[PDB]
Amino acid sequence: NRKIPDAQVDAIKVPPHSLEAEQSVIGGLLLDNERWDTVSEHVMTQDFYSRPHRLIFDGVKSILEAGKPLDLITLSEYLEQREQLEDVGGFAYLADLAKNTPSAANINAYAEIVAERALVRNLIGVANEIADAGYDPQGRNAEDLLDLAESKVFAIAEARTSENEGPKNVDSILERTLERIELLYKTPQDGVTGVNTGFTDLNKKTAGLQGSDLIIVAARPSMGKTTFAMNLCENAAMEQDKPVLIFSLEMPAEQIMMRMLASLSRVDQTKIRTGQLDDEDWARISSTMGILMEKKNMYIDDSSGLTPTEVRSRARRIAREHGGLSLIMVDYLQLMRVPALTDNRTLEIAEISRSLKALAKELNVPVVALSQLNRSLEQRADKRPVNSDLRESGSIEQDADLIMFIYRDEVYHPDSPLKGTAEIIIGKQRNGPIGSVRLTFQGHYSRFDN
């Protein structure tokens, strides 16, 4: 029983490592300084297990970043200046590192091994931290511990998310371009290549709601911004097998559903609210409900003050159940929060916009985000909304792939000949033309028609 713990302590206390790969990376850089650009993309100083190798690698990094030639003497002088040469094993050990790896062109493979070992080392460290938190919660509830575990594991995965993206040569872009064209040609392209908007005129200009697109729908209050976005959701839910995810930060799920019922059933929204539904109204609502229940392809999250991380987490959860998502709608971008950027609202909104674009690319799903137009527009009130009206609220234009504005002349001019008509202005579009689409606005039904 006394010989059992010594072998177990030696085999369990040593984390995964590769001293040989670490030595080969260092030795290889001493042989060919030009490989630093590639090696620096794979490994960081903290990726090394051995303390002496971290100090040596830090020296290598400092010399090469300064544009100085990396050799045994230069590195030794660097470490000597910081009184770290004795801590790494002396000049003899540096010479041994250069001697023990006479082979070049394999340095990238050794860098990947060092990075892989560091990843497992970080994973074990996180597992121990989570275990410690589980044993000693220090006042944290189960939900907080689950969120902590998810956050720490997600951080490990995020670090290894886009590791080898640097080199972007024309041959690679041509292959991806042809692959994309091939995919479009294989799918039925009768004017719509993405998620159907339900509006022919809009689809003619946008070719549908594209995957990976961050779409900003902006309007002044009561222009039908929520109404328009919901019609896009309704169309995606009725035409796609994949689910629609709605983050209703302003309105409750019951209210969104009631408006949806008013829209799909073409029943007066006021009648639904007041309960004065006739036999015909009940039959239409019931038929609509029957279809919605048959489809079951819609999720409504009415949680307030969600962070981009929480939005991403919930989206991934649902996407895993169905092998993807048809559309993600975020009710009001400005209602989201970023605890790290509370000191600056503009930067906070800019980060939310960047995070939602990253979410769109990550899940290959169109992300519709609703935004409010700046108050300065009402002072002018002479022309249609423009991109500058949104720039004043967080520079969201830079991250958006598509910007759509909602304008109703009847709101500003009740005697307008365009009563019941809403203009959808394309303010920005990466994969199509800019312009305007006229839609029939039916406020009583909370619906837009072509």
Q: Does 221 bind a second copy (CB under 8 A)?
A: yes
Which stretch in 43-51, 103-111, 194-202, 280-288 sits in contact with a second copy by CB under 8 A? 103-111
Q: Does 48 bind a second copy (CB under 8 A)?
A: no
Cα–Cα distance, 245 to 29 (Å, whole number): 49
Among 444, 445, 443, 436, which residue's Cα sits nearest to residue 199? 436
206 marked as binding residue:
no
Compute the least distance from the CB of residue 218 to Mg ion, in Å.
12
DSSP 357-372: HHHHHHHT--EEEEEE
222 marked as binding residue:
yes
Handedness of CA 102, 108, 111, 113 (dihedral sign): negative
Which stretch in 274-282, 291-299, 345-353, 429-437 sits in contact with ligand ADP by CB under 6 A? 429-437
287 marked as binding residue:
no
The residue with tokens 């949680």 is 303
Q: After which residues is the chain discontinuous, taking C to N > 2.5 Å?
A: none
Which stretch in 169-177, 280-288, 404-412, 414-422 sits in contact with a second copy by CB under 8 A? 169-177
Within 151-180, which residues bind ligand ADP (CB under 6 A)? none
Q: Does 187 bind a second copy (CB under 8 A)?
A: no
| Interface pick for a second copy out of 347, 409, 418, 421 (rule CB under 8 A) | 347
Q: Does 433 bind ligand ADP (CB under 6 A)?
A: yes
226 marked as binding residue:
yes
Of residues 152 and 271, the one with the C-beta less far from ligand ADP: 271
| Interface pick for ligand ADP out of 43, 192, 202, 219 (rule CB under 6 A) | 219
Look up residue 212 and give its DSSP letter.
T
74: tokens are: 């230069």
Q: Does 227 bind Mg ion (CB under 5 A)?
A: no
What binding mask, one character per residue, do residues 242-281 give for ligand ADP by CB under 6 A, x or -? ---------------------------xx-----------
250 marked as binding residue:
yes
Of residues 58 and 410, the one with the C-beta less far from ligand ADP: 410
Of residues 44 and 347, the one with the C-beta less far from a second copy: 347
- Closest-CB residue for ligand ADP? 443
3: tokens are: 């010989």
Cα–Cα distance, 91 to 69 (Å, whole number): 18
Q: Does 226 bind ligand ADP (CB under 6 A)?
A: yes
| Interface pick for Mg ion out of 77, 96, 116, 250 (rule CB under 5 A) | 250
Q: Does 231 bind Mg ion (CB under 5 A)?
A: no
224 CB-near residues (< 8 Å, 6+ apart): 406, 408, 422, 441, 443, 446, 448
What binding mask, one character per residue, do residues 398-417 give for a second copy by CB under 8 A, x or -? xx------------------
Q: Does 87 bind a second copy (CB under 8 A)?
A: no
Q: Does 443 bind a second copy (CB under 8 A)?
A: no
H helix or E strand, kind and range, residue 177: helix 170-186
Of residues 1 and 192, the one with the C-beta less far from a second copy: 192
Contact 197, 209 (CB under 8 A): yes
- Please work out the total of residues on this chain that contact a second copy, with binding judged by CB under 8 A: 124
Strand partners, 216: 369, 403
Within 320-349, which residues bind Mg ion (CB under 5 A)? 331
Beta-sheet strands, E only, within 258-337: 298-301, 327-330
226: tokens are: 């929520």
Contact 69, 78 (CB under 8 A): no
Which stretch in 92-100, 103-111, 195-203, 432-440 sits in contact with ligand ADP by CB under 6 A? 432-440
Q: Does 344 bind a second copy (CB under 8 A)?
A: yes
The one-letter amino acid at 273: R
Contact 288, 264 (CB under 8 A): yes
Cα–Cα distance, 162 to 175 (Å, whole number): 19
Strand partners, 300: 246
Q: Which residues of 21-58 are buried (b: 16+ CB within 10 A; e: fewer)?
A: bbbbbbbbbbbebebbeebbebbeeebbbeebbbbbbb
| Interface pick for a second copy out of 9, 104, 127, 283 (rule CB under 8 A) | 127
Contact 249, 216 (CB under 8 A): no
Beta-sheet strands, E only, within 270-400: 298-301, 327-330, 367-372
Residues forming contacts to ligand ADP in the complex (CB under 6 A) are 219, 221-227, 269-270, 432-434, 443-444, 446
Residues forming contacts to Mg ion in the complex (CB under 5 A) are 226, 250, 331
